[PDB]
């Protein structure tokens, strides 16, 4: 499992990370299409003997949500990378015609549309 907290890793809150947490993630987490992505893929339970050989970095929305809650990221680009990894993992392991690939593509389109309204200049927030 991927780590969601690390005192040795620089992390903080920015205006963009706060937007991804309170606006973007809040909308994607409740979306109908998000259910296959809300927790890690369990290769043992699902019978995927080659999943962890094909997928080098598993990622799911629950891990991203916990990283946002724990101020794990330093910049919004790190959170964008985790989303990109989650979507691309599905594109790699599954066939282009599989329904789950279209579910990921649709969620990715929503994600990118919501990110378009993100604050364009990243600024660290320290007031609590």
């Amino acid at each position: 499992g991927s780590e969601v907290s690390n005192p040795k890793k620089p992390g903080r809150v920015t205006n963009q990370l706060q937007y991804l947490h309170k606006v973007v993630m809040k909308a994607l987490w409740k979306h109908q299409f998000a259910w296959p992505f809300r927790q890690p893929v369990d290769a043992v339970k699902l019978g995927l003997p080659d999943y962890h050989k094909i997928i080098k970095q598993p990622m799911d929305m629950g891990t991203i949500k916990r990283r946002l809650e724990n101020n794990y990221y330093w910049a919004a680009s790190e959170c964008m990378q985790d989303f990109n990894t989650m979507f691309t993992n599905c594109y790699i392991y599954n066939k282009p015609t599989d329904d789950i690939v279209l579910m990921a593509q649709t969620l990715e389109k929503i994600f990118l549309q919501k990110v378009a309204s993100m604050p364009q200049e990243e600024q660290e927030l320290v007031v609590t």
Partner: peptide
Amino acid sequence: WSWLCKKYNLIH
């Protein structure tokens, strides 16, 4: 019926 059942039928 469950999440695991539907996840299984979807990914396969």
